[PDB]
Write a protein that binds this ligand. Structure first.
Ligand SMILES: CCCCCCCCCCCCCCCCCC(=O)OC[C@H](COP(=O)([O-])OCC(O)COP(=O)([O-])OC[C@@H](COC(=O)CCCCCCCCCCCCCCCCC)OC(=O)CCCCCCCCCCCCCCCCC)OC(=O)CCCCCCCCCCCCCCCCC
Ligand SMILES: CCCCCCCCCCCCCCCCCC(=O)OC[C@H](COP(=O)([O-])OCC(O)COP(=O)([O-])OC[C@@H](COC(=O)CCCCCCCCCCCCCCCCC)OC(=O)CCCCCCCCCCCCCCCCC)OC(=O)CCCCCCCCCCCCCCCCC
Ligand SMILES: CCCCCCCCCCCCCCCCCC(=O)OC[C@H](COP(=O)(O)OCCN)OC(=O)CCCCCCCCCCCCCCCCC
Ligand SMILES: CCCCCCCCCCCCCCCCCC(=O)OC[C@H](COP(=O)(O)OCCN)OC(=O)CCCCCCCCCCCCCCCCC
Ligand SMILES: CCCCCCCCCCCCCCCCCC(=O)OC[C@H](COP(=O)(O)OCCN)OC(=O)CCCCCCCCCCCCCCCCC
Ligand SMILES: CCCCCCCCCCCCCCCCCC(=O)OC[C@H](COP(=O)(O)OCCN)OC(=O)CCCCCCCCCCCCCCCCC
Ligand SMILES: CCCCCCCCCCCCCCCCCC(=O)OC[C@H](COP(=O)(O)OCCN)OC(=O)CCCCCCCCCCCCCCCCC
Ligand SMILES: CCCCCCCCCCCCCCCCCC(=O)OC[C@H](COP(=O)(O)OCCN)OC(=O)CCCCCCCCCCCCCCCCC
Ligand SMILES: CCCCCCCCCCCCO[C@@H]1O[C@H](CO)[C@@H](O[C@H]2O[C@H](CO)[C@@H](O)[C@H](O)[C@H]2O)[C@H](O)[C@H]1O
Ligand SMILES: CCCCCCCCCCCCO[C@@H]1O[C@H](CO)[C@@H](O[C@H]2O[C@H](CO)[C@@H](O)[C@H](O)[C@H]2O)[C@H](O)[C@H]1O
Ligand SMILES: Nc1nc2c(ncn2[C@@H]2O[C@H](COP(=O)(O)OP(=O)(O)OP(=O)(O)O)[C@@H](O)[C@H]2O)c(=O)[nH]1
Ligand SMILES: N=C(N)NC(=N)NCCc1ccc(I)c(Cl)c1
Ligand SMILES: [Mg+2]
Lengths: 48, 140, 320, 174, 112, 347, 39, 104, 98
């Protein structure tokens, strides 16, 4: 215990950390799914 | 401003000097009146007569510049026999600058005004010759 | 949930935690009036939180590890130098006074933040309302310049206007001859150099200006030195107060929320204590302030925001 | 003639405007607006707008102008200054009446006038509709349609009035 | 369409690659925002809150991808409209008769 | 102000703007402006002092006058076309009245006098709204009625605004007045290009808002409202001084920063229309803005001004203000030029 | 010599009501630090 | 024409009664025997302003007897209640914010 | 146009000039602002009634309602100005000169 008053950010906000990482994972999965769906629709529409 | 500018730019350069000098005096006077109106509105004169005096001093000053530019620029074009010459306007613009150096009595202002009003007048003549648009109509 | 509008919306309203025991008490007096001892007894008996008088190192006590910092990080303000050489050309006299008013302003904010957050009252020894008595004494004795006084009033004008005055003002009135005798008995070599004229100036300002002003808006209790010995009677006097004055009657949850948002943000508290008024006594050149600030960031646990200092044991910095 | 009633009312309408627009004591300026409001209602009445005419009386004169007079008596003027006592007010008042009289005289002499823009002076009746035989008021049908057609208008209007209450309580708390 | 970010006809175009250089730059901008967030709050700039720094990159990339999709679609529409108009009005866009430099006369300006 | 009430009042400021942007009826556009003006006044008044009351009154008189002129334009348009659709107006006198009304709402010269005074008299957060969100609704109407605006009128307003904004800012030490004159100058670029390519008007508006929000947010972070107070930032938050420097240079239109992009694109569109004198005059006159932006960089970042002793007490406390979105906005404010072709999304 | 940095005399150039003093704005004063004028 | 005549008669008679009430024989032959804040509560301002806002709401409710003749009764009834409820919310806001109090 | 329109537009112009040419009282200027509203209401009502634009018959009411709410806000600012200075004179509102 160094600080005389416990700092507001002494310990991680695990709920915020979990939401933050979970949000990042979701956006990446969504982005890759969207890109994949876009590529196929493009190939289908152009006959490739 | 449209019609006055139309009278001036209809008269051939270097000719009908009295009509050119009238057109610029009216243009100069109108600019003086506009300046007086804002000056009186935003910087309230101490009295009714001070405000009237300021209106006359500014308007006469602006009409004086307009008259000298029109006469000198038309006299130059007539004498030199060069109607479509920006130099004539450069001469008239500096004459106006000298007048503004006289009404304000400041050799420095006169010298600066003559160069800048002289250059500006020459560019106006070039623009008329070559069709430069200040407020260009939209086209693309 | 650090306090804010969201916490306020969800039910953290000051009137819920406050009672008729939620009071702000300030003990005042001349030097060596036993006001420190009285302040502790009132707090103990009334179950309040006691604040020792805010000195040169009060802010250090509230930040970092709480231990005092070297002098250069308080600008080199010395109370001892004030007594030895009150007219020093370095401007220590007013620089100390300007620093101490800022220290009191910070303490008043801590005390108000404690009262509004927990509901427990507090006891202070002097406050930003009585800090000026020392300024008046300094000026009348020719220790500070007229310009310093003007600067002090400018800073006080835009700071004190934000805060509510104390509920109860307690004054322990000790005469200057008795004050002067207790000083020589206390045996602090620098303090004994204090002169009765300076002490009389403090008394005059207290009685001439402070007490009449606080009487309009606070509850003022005055005790002689003998009467202050009877702390139980002092506490008894406080508990029988009507409280029918001042702005504390006008406060409601909306206003106290605005007040709590101010006092919790300490930089917002101290904003005007550094107004750009270039008084030689408190002005610091760029080279010096740059050099001192760089040293300050090298002190243990000071380079980063609290909780982000690996050099003092903070962990999980990469998830914070 | 009563064939020019709308034109005559509009002449008085303008005179009332030159009255308060010259800005005498706010008490008398308020009177000029009240007279103009009543004359303005009469103009709307003669075009077939009975409800709209009575709203001016009910809301504009009995509502807003009452609160204007109320506020004037409180926070502006408690005793009027003599009307037209100030030269600036008199000059402005006379100038507006002189302009108005010239318009009226010229439009009546030629049954038309060009004051900036060209107007007809044959009388306003000439433009009226010539075929009405319905069993209802059309103005009433239109206003009643606020509740069937104007759902969006009701929502934003009702919201603004509520916010007006909240806002004015914030402004005045000080 | 009408008030549509990406109309259905935009789906006939190749999507931006996930390795698009412009998308890499957008991700880099998000990374810079993460560092500035640490700096203005006096945290260790490179190490603090990697979870927060990861979301800064992801958010920028996610929005940047859709912005790049709309950008390419709008330029495809500009070209589509232009070529269709050139076809609709062949009278205004005739094929110029081209002459070789042996036939075209150019004045010569000596530098002496 | 009760926090829930503050939120509802803020939501009503936004709703008034949104009604203007989605409306197809002139009456609903007028309502949006009236609703917006009703909700903005309380946030100008919220600190209860004579300066705030004077600012709110001057704002009320200006905006209520402009809204009456707008209603007059709408009614003339109704008489000469028998319809209310938001689009080109069918009467030149209606077009002038609506253009003048929108100029007054935007604070364009010569209707500019209220902007420096109102901005000075209200808190920073309120000034941020006034100079950013409040430009959206009047610009969104100009975006739609431009086919019928008088070219000489709109370009005269643009030229006067750039001149008055540039000259007016040269004489200011108050940060809120500097931003006000900067806003007047930037409104001039937005409207100058409107007759030629409204998309560039949107691009300049968006980039203007991002950069202006960044400046106000950095001023709020340190509670600075004067030049000298800002000059103490180097001794408290050195990182902030660098962010201010970058943002000011960007606002000055210097490449390779973001703020160069709107000037670059506007010059391009004007030249395509054979407008050469006006863009050149505009670009040179904007150097006046660059001058009083540079002055601020000198006293904030590139030199170290004198400090005070009490500043040391501030060293022991961290910044607690929200600074919402500041890291994102400062990056956009400075590092967007390589993505310039992205402007086509605004088509 | 160490790098020159602004002194008090340099700083006060920017602490006035206007940057360019004139006869007209001689009576102008800087506004209150907290924007509040006394009643 | 009738309404004009009735109005003209009513106020002309009122005028005649007032002037004669002022100028009647007196039978005597001897000599006969400003724009500031009035000290008035802000509460009275708020009453008048509150009346105005409620009066504007009433103007919108006045068409209700005609609106009830519509075939779009579902919409009409929903909007009537919405407007009156919003009027009630306005009153509830003034009430709970001590806007209807006369103390202090 | 019709003869009535000459005077209704004249009334609006007269009140606009009255509004732009201040004297001392803020209330006098607020009255001119209401004058412009009243002339707008009449001009709109005449146009709408004569043309038999049935659904537009509600528009003058909406104009009246919203502008009265505007006037209520204007009056509230006037009393706050009067509380500060003891009068509603515009010359007192010149602090932001500097
Ligand atoms: C159809 C169009 C509309 C039709 C309108 C018809 C009239 C109906 C009424 C309309 C409302 C008018 C309102 C008038 C008003 O209230 O002004 C009060 C205004 C100021 O009120 P004040 O506080 O009592 O002070 C009075 C003086 O200003 C004295 O106080 P001072 O301290 O200001 O003394 C110094 C004095 C100094 O005066 C000067 O120096 C003027 C010198 C100019 C010489 C040229 O300054 C002034 O007089 C201010 C004006 C300065 C001139 C501005 C530029 C012109 O007084 C005037 O300015 C009088 C002007 C009245 C003429 C009205 C004519 C209206 C025509 C509009 C143009 C339409 C053409 C198309
Ligand atoms: C292509 C053109 C150029 C590129 C275009 C770029 C356009 C901008 C992209 C969007 C930028 C959003 C900011 C990036 C996110 C990083 C902030 C973060 O890590 O917050 C984590 C956040 C809280 O972290 P923190 O400890 O409070 O500090 C983070 C910053 O200081 C938070 O400080 P703050 O005041 O800046 O917070 C801003 C954010 C509130 O903070 C957030 O919660 C971030 C939400 C980002 C949503 C992702 C948007 C992309 C998805 C599009 C749909 O405001 C919002 O509500 C989002 C708008 O944890 C979460 O709850 C994740 C969100 C859960 C859903
Ligand atoms: C200060 C310098 C201002 C220039 C002097 C005003 C002038 O001489 O031009 C008046 C101008 C005439 O423009 P106009 O001929 O009607 O139509 C545009 C043709 N391209 O009038 C105008 O239409 C523009 C008015 C310009 C106002 C000053 C900027
Ligand atoms: C839209 C179409 C409008 C075209 C007209 C545009 C002109 C708008 C001018 C707006 C700015 C007015 C403020 C200003 O320029 O300064 C006022 C100035 C007062 O100073 P002054 O009396 O002229 O000189 C004494 C100096 N010792 O006096 C003036 O300079 C007033 C003249 C400015 C106009 C030239
Ligand atoms: C693919 C590789 C790309 C390489 C090129 C990158 C440069 C172009 C992008 C620049 C855009 C700005 C990037 C965001 C700035 C981040 C740096 C920063 O703001 O913090 C400075 C930090 C100071 O050190 P520190 O002890 O951590 O103290 C923190 C004070 N709050 O410094 C540190 O000690 C942290 C270590 C990283 C510092 C990076 C500094 C970059 C400076 C760029 C200046 C602007 C460009 C010119
Ligand atoms: C300072 C503030 C005021 C700004 C200066 C005032 C503007 C001066 C403009 C000079 C005239 C340039 C011009 O207008 O040319 C227009 C003309 C357009 O005609 P176009 O149809 O495109 O092609 C056929 C040519 N008639 O032909 C052209 O477009 C050719 C012109 C190409 C672009 C010229 C760029 C500006 C030239 C003026 C600056 C040159 C001097 C720079 C000196 C700076 C020294 C530090
Ligand atoms: C793209 C640009 C995005 C701009 C984001 C700006 C967010 C605001 C900047 C963060 C500053 C901290 C903050 O919370 O905002 C301050 C302000 C509230 O004021 P404050 O005094 O701090 O507390 C309120 C208590 N009465 O909060 C506010 O009122 C927000 C004011 C800014 C809203 C306008 C933003 C510009 C318009 C964006 C639309 C783009 C189209
Ligand atoms: C990518 C394509 C687009 C290209 C466009 C150009 C991009 C560049 C613009 C990016 C936006 C600016 C971001 C700059 C981040 C700044 C961070 C940094 O460099 O360090 C700041 C430094 C940290 O100081 P401190 O907080 O105390 O922590 C260390 C302990 N001493 O603070 C200090 O120590 C104070 C330093 C003194 C002031 C020196 C200022 C000169 C350096 C300016 C660097 C930023 C450049 C801004 C202008 C753009 C340049 C192109
Ligand atoms: C291509 C552009 C060509 C433009 C040509 C413009 C020529 C203008 C010549 C102006 C010359 C002087 O320009 C400026 O004016 C004043 C005269 O009042 C000069 O005269 C100076 O003299 C003394 C110095 O002992 C002082 O009173 C003061 O410094 C100033 O009045 C200044 O030193 C100069 O800053
Ligand atoms: C320091 C420099 C500051 C900026 C200087 C900017 C100068 C800009 C040049 C002025 C603008 C050009 O000036 C304008 O050109 C057009 C050419 O179509 C002229 O056009 C004229 O042509 C015909 C015949 O020639 C005339 O009968 C007619 O009156 C007019 O249309 C205008 O009469 C002139 O007013
Ligand atoms: N110059 C100056 N000295 C101060 C100030 N506040 C306290 N001091 C000094 O702090 C020293 C001790 O304060 P005191 O509490 O009054 O003395 P004490 O004897 O220890 O405590 P008490 O018995 O209660 O009076 C005194 O020498 C004061 O001069 C101040 O605002 N300015
Ligand atoms: N109004 C203008 N002058 N410019 C303009 N918008 N021209 C339309 C041409 C255009 C240009 C870019 C794109 I991407 C698209 Cl789709 C269309
Ligand atoms: Mg003690």
């Amino acid at each position: 215990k160094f600080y005389i008053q416990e700092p507001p950010h002494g310990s991680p906000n695990w709920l915020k950390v979990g939401l933050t990482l979970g949000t990042s994972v979701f956006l990446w999965i969504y982005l890759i799914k969207q890109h994949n769906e876009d590529v196929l629709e493009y190939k289908r529409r152009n006959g490739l | 401003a449209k019609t006055v500018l139309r009278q001036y730019w209809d008269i051939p350069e270097g000719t009908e000097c009295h009509r050119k000098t009238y057109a610029t005096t009216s243009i100069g006077g109108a600019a003086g009146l506009v300046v007086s109106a804002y000056s009186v509105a935003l910087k309230t004169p101490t009295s009714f007569l001070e405000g009237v005096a300021r209106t006359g001093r500014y308007t006469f000053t602006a009409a004086a510049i307009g008259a000298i530019f029109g006469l000198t620029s038309c006299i130059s074009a007539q004498v030199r026999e060069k109607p479509d010459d920006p130099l004539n306007y450069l001469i008239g613009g500096c004459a106006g600058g000298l007048i503004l150096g006289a009404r304000t009595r400041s050799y420095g202002i006169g010298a600066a005004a003559c160069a800048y009003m002289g250059l500006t007048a020459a560019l106006v003549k070039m623009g008329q010759l070559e069709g430069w648009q200040v407020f260009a109509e939209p086209k693309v | 949930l650090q306090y804010g509008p969201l916490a306020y919306i969800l039910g953290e309203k000051a009137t819920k935690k406050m009672t008729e025991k939620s009071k702000l008490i300030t003990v005042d007096g001349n030097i060596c009036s036993g006001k420190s001892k009285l302040a502790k007894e009132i707090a103990e008996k009334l179950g309040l939180k006691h604040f020792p008088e805010a000195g040169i190192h009060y802010v250090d006590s509230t930040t970092g590890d709480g231990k005092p910092l070297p002098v250069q990080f308080s600008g080199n303000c010395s109370l001892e130098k004030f007594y030895d050489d009150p007219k020093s050309n370095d401007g220590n006299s007013y620089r100390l006074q300007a620093w101490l008013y800022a220290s009191r302003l910070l303490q008043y904010a801590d005390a108000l933040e404690h009262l509004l957050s927990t509901g427990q009252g507090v006891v202070l020894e002097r406050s930003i309302y009585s800090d000026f008595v020392f300024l008046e004494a300094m000026y009348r004795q020719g220790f500070i310049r007229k310009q310093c006084v003007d600067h002090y009033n400018q800073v006080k004008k835009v700071t004190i206007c934000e805060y509510l005055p104390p509920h109860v003002v307690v004054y322990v009135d000790v005469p200057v001859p008795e004050v002067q005798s207790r000083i020589q008995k206390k045996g602090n070599p620098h303090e004994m150099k204090i002169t009765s004229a300076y002490l009389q100036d403090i008394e005059n300002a207290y009685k001439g200006t402070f007490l009449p002003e606080m009487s309009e808006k606070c509850e003022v209790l005055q005790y002689s030195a003998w009467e202050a010995q009877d702390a139980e009677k002092v506490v008894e006097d406080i508990e029988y107060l009507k409280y029918d004055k001042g702005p504390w009657l006008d406060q409601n949850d909306r206003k106290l929320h605005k007040l709590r948002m101010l006092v919790q943000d300490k930089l917002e508290v101290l904003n005007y204590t550094s107004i750009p008024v270039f008084l030689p006594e408190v002005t610091v050149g760029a080279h010096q302030s740059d050099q001192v600030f760089q040293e300050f960031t090298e002190l243990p646990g000071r380079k980063y925001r609290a909780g982000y200092n690996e050099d003092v044991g903070d962990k999980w910095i990469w998830l914070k | 003639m009563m064939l020019y009633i709308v034109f005559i009312l509009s002449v008085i309408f303008v005179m009332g405007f030159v009255g308060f627009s010259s800005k005498p004591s706010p008490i008398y300026g308020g009177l000029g607006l009240i007279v103009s409001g009543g004359v303005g209602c009469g103009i709307v009445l003669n075009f077939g707008g009975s409800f709209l005419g009575l709203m001016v009386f009910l809301i504009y004169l009995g509502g807003m102008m009452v609160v204007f007079g109320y506020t004037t008596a409180m926070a502006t003027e408690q005793y009027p200054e003599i009307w037209l006592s100030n030269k600036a007010v008199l000059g402005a008042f006379v100038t507006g009446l002189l302009m108005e009289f010239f318009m009226v005289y010229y439009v009546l002499k030629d049954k038309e006038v060009e004051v900036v823009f060209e107007f007809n002076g044959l009388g306003d009746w000439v433009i009226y509709d010539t075929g009405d035989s319905g069993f209802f008021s059309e103005e009433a049908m239109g206003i009643a349609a606020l509740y069937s057609y104007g759902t969006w208008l009701v929502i934003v209007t009702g919201w603004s009035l509520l916010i007006g209450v909240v806002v004015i309580m914030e402004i005045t708390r000080g | 369409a009408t008030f549509q970010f990406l109309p259905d006809e935009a789906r006939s175009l190749p999507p931006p690659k996930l390795t698009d250089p412009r998308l890499a730059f957008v991700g880099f901008l998000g990374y810079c925002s993460g560092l500035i967030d640490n700096a203005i709050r006096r945290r260790p700039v490179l190490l603090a809150g990697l979870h927060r720094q990861l979301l800064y990159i992801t958010s920028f990339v996610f929005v940047g991808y859709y912005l790049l999709k709309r950008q390419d679609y709008m330029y495809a529409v500009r070209d589509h409209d232009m070529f269709s108009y050139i076809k609709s009005h062949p009278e205004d866009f005739p094929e110029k008769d081209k002459k070789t430099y042996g036939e075209v006369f150019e004045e010569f300006h000596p530098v002496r | 102000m009760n926090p829930i009430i503050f939120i509802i009042i803020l939501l009503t400021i936004m709703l008034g703007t949104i009604i203007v942007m989605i409306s197809s009826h002139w009456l609903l556009v007028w309502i949006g402006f009236e609703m917006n003006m009703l909700a903005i006044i309380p946030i100008m008044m919220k600190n209860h002092n004579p300066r705030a009351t004077e600012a709110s009154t001057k704002y009320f008189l200006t905006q209520s006058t402009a809204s009456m002129l707008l209603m007059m334009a709408v009614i003339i348009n109704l008489m000469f076309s028998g319809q209310w659709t938001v689009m080109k107006l069918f009467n030149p006198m209606a077009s002038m009245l609506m253009t003048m009304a929108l100029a007054m709402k935007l604070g364009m010269a010569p209707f500019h006098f209220w902007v420096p005074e109102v901005t000075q008299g209200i808190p920073l957060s309120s000034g941020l709204i006034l100079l950013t969100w409040q430009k959206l609704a009047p610009m969104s109407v100009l975006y739609q009625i431009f086919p019928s605006i008088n070219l000489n009128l709109i370009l005269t307003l643009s030229v006067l605004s750039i001149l008055i904004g540039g000259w007016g800012g040269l004489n200011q030490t108050q940060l809120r007045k500097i931003m006000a004159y900067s806003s007047i100058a930037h409104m001039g670029w937005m409207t100058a290009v409107l007759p030629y390519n409204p998309t560039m008007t949107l691009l300049n508006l968006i980039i203007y808002i991002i950069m202006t929000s960044t400046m106000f947010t950095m001023f709020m972070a340190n509670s600075t409202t004067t030049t000298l107070s800002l000059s103490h930032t180097w001794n408290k938050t050195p990182i902030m001084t660098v962010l201010i420097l970058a943002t000011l240079l960007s606002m000055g239109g210097l490449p390779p920063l973001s703020g160069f992009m709107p000037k670059w694109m506007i010059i391009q569109e004007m030249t395509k229309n054979n407008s050469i004198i006006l863009p050149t005059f505009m670009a040179i006159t904007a150097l006046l803005n660059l001058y009083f932006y540079m002055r601020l960089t000198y006293s904030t970042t590139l030199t170290m001004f004198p400090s005070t002793n009490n500043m040391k007490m501030k060293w022991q406390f961290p910044l607690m203000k929200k600074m919402t979105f500041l890291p994102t906005m400062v990056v956009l404010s400075t590092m967007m030029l390589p993505l310039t072709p992205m402007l086509s999304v605004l088509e | 010599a160490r790098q020159w940095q602004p002194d008090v005399e340099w700083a006060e150039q920017y602490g006035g009501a206007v940057m360019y003093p004139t006869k007209e704005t001689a009576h102008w004063k800087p506004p209150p630090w907290n924007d509040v004028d006394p009643p | 024409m009738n309404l004009m005549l009735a109005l003209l008669t009513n106020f002309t008679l009122a005028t005649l009664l007032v002037i004669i009430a002022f100028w009647l024989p007196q039978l005597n032959v001897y000599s006969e025997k400003g724009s500031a804040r009035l000290p008035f509560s802000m509460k009275f301002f708020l009453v008048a302003i509150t009346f105005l806002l409620f009066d504007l709401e009433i103007a919108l409710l006045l068409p209700l007897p005609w609106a009830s003749q519509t075939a779009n009764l579902n919409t009409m009834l929903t909007m009537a209640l919405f407007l009156i409820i919003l009027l009630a919310v306005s009153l509830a806001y003034e009430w709970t914010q001590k806007g209807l109090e006369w103390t202090e | 146009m019709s003869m009535v329109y000459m005077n209704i537009m004249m009334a609006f112009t007269v009140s606009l000039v009255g509004l732009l040419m201040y004297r001392s009282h803020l209330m006098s200027s607020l009255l001119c602002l209401e004058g412009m509203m009243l002339s707008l209401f009449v001009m709109a009502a005449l146009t709408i009634l004569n043309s038999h634009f049935t659904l537009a018959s509600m528009m003058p009411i909406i104009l009246l309602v919203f502008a009265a709410c505007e006037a209520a806000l204007g009056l509230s600012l006037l009393v706050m100005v009067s509380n500060t200075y003891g009068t509603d004179y515009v010359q007192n509102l010149n602090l932001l000169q500097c």
